[PDB]
């Protein structure tokens, strides 16, 4: 029957369960779960089965949000559709944990070393868990990372082609790793480049590499970090190597010049040391050559991060994803509707 009530939230309508009360918009609502007695977030996906792109994205997010459980990754609390049959099926509502803000607000703060390293520690724990689950985000950025007033942090979604709609409605290119831009493959640590850019932006309160397009992104990188060595050029493909090796050559500033001590809190024997550790970690993440860039595991062992290490958070068991669910299998719009409906019906 109809255990629902519809509410006008802007242009569209929100037909949710009566357990969720007082819907406030943030194309995603915030409500109070009277059963769980705590505020939640409600995302609405209208006709996700309409085409391949929307359908794949929604299918992965559902499957993955159900399987993955980590406290630094936003979790699924509930999922329902107000329609009662496959013929009438239309919308999907995904109830999630509610957070207070995204990093874009934290970046404008002058944080202390404890909060900075603790926020970063949580980022890496989440990233690591995703990796163990065979998920490389490939699209980290401050708008994808959300925080709470108790200084907790979570990763908001699963990234490229695994996300459907924006909760906390920041361009991707600013944080995209060069191996992608230069036509090279990618391994787990592309996400670590982004952490480097996000960490840097936190330090100096500015976008590290603000380019006009993807290509200009490469110009902003070598201007700051210096043209890479010839052993890296040999890994490029002919067309890319021809373009890269005809760029103006840049020496690149040291990470002391990129991130001086004035940017950090430095008024103590402990603070001036902590400033160098953050700079060291930055110099191990912001590395063009991904073969010389450290891993997520190594980032968690760094002196700047390891203070908070807890094996229950940084070494949690990986999830068991059902076999061959996230492949590039093409389907009809009706096949998608049935797969998605099967995952949403009560």
């Amino acid at each position: 029957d109809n255990n629902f009530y519809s509410v006008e939230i802007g242009d569209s309508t929100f037909t949710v369960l009566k357990r969720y009360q007082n819907l406030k918009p943030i194309i995603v609502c915030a409500a109070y779960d009277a059963i769980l007695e705590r505020n939640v977030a409600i995302k609405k996906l209208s006709r996700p089965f309409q085409n391949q792109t929307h359908a794949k994205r929604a299918y992965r997010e559902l499957v993955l949000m159900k399987c993955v459980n980590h406290k630094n990754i936003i979790g699924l609390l509930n999922v329902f559709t107000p329609q009662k049959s496959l013929e009438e099926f239309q919308d999907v509502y995904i109830v999630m944990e509610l957070m207070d803000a995204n990093l874009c607000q934290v970046i404008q703060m002058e944080l202390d070393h404890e909060r900075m390293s603790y926020l970063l520690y949580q980022m890496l724990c989440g990233i690591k868990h995703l990796h163990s689950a065979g998920i490389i985000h490939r699209d980290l950025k401050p708008s994808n990372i959300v925080v709470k007033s108790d200084c907790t942090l979570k990763i908001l979604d699963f990234g490229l082609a695994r996300t459907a709609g924006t909760s906390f409605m920041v361009v991707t290119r600013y944080y995209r790793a060069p191996e992608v831009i230069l036509g090279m493959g990618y391994k787990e640590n592309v996400d670590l480049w982004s952490v480097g850019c996000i960490m840097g932006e936190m330090v100096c309160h500015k976008i590290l590499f603000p380019g006009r397009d993807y290509i200009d992104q490469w110009n902003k990188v070598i201007e700051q970090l210096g043209t890479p060595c010839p052993e890296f050029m040999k890994k490029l493909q002919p067309t890319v190597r021809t373009y890269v090796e005809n760029r103006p050559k840049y020496a690149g500033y040291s990470f002391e010049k990129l991130f001086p001590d004035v940017l950090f809190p430095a008024d103590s024997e402990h603070n001036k040391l902590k400033a160098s550790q953050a700079r060291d970690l930055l110099s191990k993440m912001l590395v063009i050559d991904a073969s010389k860039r450290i891993s997520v595991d190594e980032a968690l062992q760094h002196p700047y991060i390891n203070v908070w290490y807890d094996p229950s958070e940084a070494e949690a068991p990986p999830p068991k994803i059902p076999d061959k669910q996230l492949d590039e299998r093409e389907h009809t719009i009706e096949e998608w509707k049935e797969l998605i409906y099967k995952e949403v019906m009560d």
Binding site: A101, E114, R115, C151
Partner: peptide
């Protein structure tokens, strides 16, 4: 050292 328990947000 203790883990930060607060974060002044807007």
């Amino acid at each position: 050292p203790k883990r930060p328990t607060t974060l002044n947000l807007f």
